[PDB]
Structures are given as C-alpha cells and as structure tokens.
Structure 1
Amino acid sequence: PSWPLSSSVPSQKTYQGSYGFRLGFLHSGTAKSVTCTYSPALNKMFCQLGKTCPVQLWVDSTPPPGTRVRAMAIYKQSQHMTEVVRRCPHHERCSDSDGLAPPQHLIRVEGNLRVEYLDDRNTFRHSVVVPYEPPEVGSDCTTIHYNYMCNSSCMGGMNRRPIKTIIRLEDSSGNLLGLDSFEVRVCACPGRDRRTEEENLRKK
C-alpha cells in the first residue's frame, strides 16, 4: 500500500535520566501456553496478536506531576526505518476497535480510559500515551498493558520485518526524561518461537 514515508526517525538511544527510568518484563518462561514472553538475551518480546502484554516501568525517584509515558513502534532494519509502522490492509478495516484506538495503530493500551493516541502531523508516526502513575500500594513498579494488533507476518503491514517499541518517559510538554526500548515479534506461538531462537544461540 502507498503511504507516505516519514522524514525523520525518532530517538532510540537508551537513557535512564534523572529518575533512573528503565523497563522490566515478567519472567514468563517458554511454555506453549504463554501469551507474552520476554527474552533478555535478545531484548525481545514475543507476543500474540491482541493479547495483554505487560510492560513494567521502574524508576529510582518519582518524576514530576504531569509526567507521561509514550509508546511507538519503528522498523529495526535501517533500510525500513523511515517507513511508518502501521496495521495491514485487513486489520485496519476489520472493525476490532475498542472505541479509543485509531484503526491504523499497531500499539494499543488496554484497561486505561486516560489513554491518548497521536498521529503526528509532521512525522506521520503513530503513538499511544498515558499519564505516568507511581506504583500501586504493594508494588515496586508501574505496569502498563499493551496490545499489538497485527502479526509480524501480516503482509502489506510489517511484512515479516522486525520492529522495536520505544517507551519514552516525557514531561507534560513532551520533553524527554528517559527512554528504553525492546524488539517485538507478534506471532502465533510466542513460547515456542522464543525457545527456538534462544536454544540456538551460541553458548559462549
């Protein structure tokens, strides 16, 4: 499909910043039944389309009022980095909206009515942003539930190209306070796909 390319690439440089910001993930293992699982060796999340993908925010100090958390996908390969990551022709038309997310957006936030979605008028990139909340009573991190709404193999969309998700901790004006990122594969069996990739790594 003919969509305009972006004329920039968002920052990807990991940055803990003044608040010691970084991501964490559940240690879910590779059983066939897992719906989401993260590989630290590959810094790569494996997940199923539309299922809950918990991503943890860890900070050493609490950021100021009005702090926000933004997620955005970009292609990992340099020759595709200026192409906007978006849903494929089938999924952008299939009317699986939750009533909040634009039908073209790959990344949604589940379970948060305060969510905001952006089509950037200058860069054309899609992103989803929520208010930063500190950890709830009894927890040491903040958990956000993301959903990825196309498969990596969706033709006319990601078309088997790898992507990364960039998470930005922002002030109320959008200025960057911290940044982290991870690769994502959206697939039918995350547990087996993760184990197949990891068991074939070099044992150093």
Structure 2
Amino acid sequence: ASPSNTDYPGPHSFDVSFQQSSTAKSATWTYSTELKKLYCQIAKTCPIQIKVMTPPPQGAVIRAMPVYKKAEHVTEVVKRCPNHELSREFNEGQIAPPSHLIRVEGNSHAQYVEDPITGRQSVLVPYEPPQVGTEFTTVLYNFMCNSSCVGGMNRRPILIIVTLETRDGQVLGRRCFEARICACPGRDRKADEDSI
C-alpha cells in the first residue's frame, strides 16, 4: 500500500528537528522551519535530532523512508538513479546497497531493508537514548542522489518519512518533511523562499 505520511506524535511524543544552519557561504545543508523542507548537497552528511518524552520499548528502531510528494508518483518507489548506483564512487563502503537513496553513517547496527512485497527501500537504526544531559538523539544521514537526477527523480518533489517503530514493526510515531538534495542548498533555499 502507499506509506502513511500523516504526522503522528505517538504515545512517547516522537518529534524530530534540526538547528542552526546559517548561509555560511555554502553550508553543506540547511532546513526551513515552516516549509518542513530541507536542502542539502549530495553525499554530504546531515544531522537530525530525535526528541522523546516517555522511553520506548525494546526493539525501538527508527525507519527512515523516502517517497514522492506528488500524487501520480506516490505509486512509484525511490531508488538511486542507474548512474550513481554503478559509478562506484560512494560504493566502496559496500555496507549499503548501491540502490538505496538514504544512508545512515556512523552506526554499525543500522540495517538496510527492502520490503519484499512492495519493493520499498528503507533504513533501520536501533534507538539509543539521548546523550546523558541532552534530550535529542542525533542521527547521521546521507542522501545519494540529486533530487534532479536524470532517470532517478527528475526534480520530482520527494519527502522523507522518519518513523519510530517497535520490535515487531508496528508504528509508535511518525514525522515527516520534504527534502531537496541538490547542489547549492544555499541558493535553492533563499531563491526558493523568495518566489513566494
């Protein structure tokens, strides 16, 4: 079926967020508060804090999944274009399937999974409590294909579904935002909020 994209705080109050991302000449990435939109160069890393009020179960995992924003596309899956999934660059750390779009870095436990029935690709990472003294649980993500790759996304608006799931796999919470992995997240952001 088509994955849900309806904000769900969950029982533990599952909430994501970011932080300061000044224009910094060419910040590797930046996020817009209201637009729930994030921009960010190719393979470069990208944080993402995870708040919670009441501690989660055992399995406590955090699936990150991509999927189109536009209707007529929700039906299709999100893979890395043919080129980038062969160029070999970014494909040395073969720990990640050369087809997935989203990669978590700096976590050995993370496991890449492709739904067998729907074909949908996603990445799981065991939930580790905040850093003693903090409340956020930053996670490192890498997007492997310009949201404008020929034969891949063709500038087709796409959004990421970060969801807090349990051991068995039922949802415990879900949040969501639109991403635009590009070249100059600076321009494409100022130049974007502009238009309006």
How much does 1:99 deviate? Answer: 2.4
**Partner amino acid for 2:2?**
V
How much does 1:29 deviate? Answer: 2.2
Q: Which of residues 81, 94, 103 is equivalent to 1:99?
A: 94
- Structure 1 residues 123-162: aligned runs within 5 Å: 123-162=118-157
Q: Distance in 1 between matches of 2:133 and 2:188?
A: 33
Q: Report Cα offsets for 1:151-188 as digits up to 9, x if no partner.
A: 01110001110100001100101100000010000111
Q: What is the count of residue pairs matched by the alignment?
A: 194
Of Structure 1 and Structure 2, which has the larger fraction of its residues in strand?
1
Verify: 1:37 aligned to 2:30, yes or no: yes
State the TM-score, normalized to the length of structure 1: 0.92
Q: Distance in 1 between matches of 2:81 and 2:126?
A: 28
Q: Distance in 1 between matches of 2:144 and 2:167?
A: 27
Tell me the residue number matched to 2:65: 72
Tell me the residue number matched to 1:112: 107
Q: Distance in 2 between matches of 1:159 and 1:30?
A: 26
**Partner amino acid for 2:105?**
E
Q: Which of residues 54, 74, 78 is equivalent to 1:81?
A: 74
How much does 1:40 deviate? Answer: 1.3
Does structure 2 retain, via aligned residues, the 8 Å contact 1:87–1:106? yes
How much does 1:89 deviate? Answer: 1.1
**Partner amino acid for 1:111?**
G
Q: Distance in 2 between matches of 1:32 and 1:45?
A: 17
Tell me the residue number matched to 1:167: 162
Q: Distance in 1 between matches of 2:55 and 2:113?
A: 25
Q: Distance in 1 between matches of 2:55 and 2:154?
A: 39
The SS at the match of 2:16 is strand
Q: Which of residues 7, 19, 23 is equivalent to 1:26?
A: 19
Does 137-146 or 104-113 show the bigger shift?
Answer: 137-146
Q: Which of residues 44, 53, 58 is equivalent to 1:60?
A: 53
Does structure 2 retain, via aligned residues, the 8 Å contact 1:32–1:192? no
Does structure 2 retain, via aligned residues, the 8 Å contact 1:48–1:190? yes
Q: Distance in 1 between matches of 2:25 and 2:38?
A: 15
The SS at the match of 1:80 is helix
The SS at the match of 2:124 is strand
What 5-or-longer segments of structure 2 have no aligned partner?
A: none
Divergent runs of 4+, >2 A: 29-32
Q: Distance in 2 between matches of 1:32 and 1:105?
A: 30
State the TM-score, normalized to the length of structure 2: 0.96
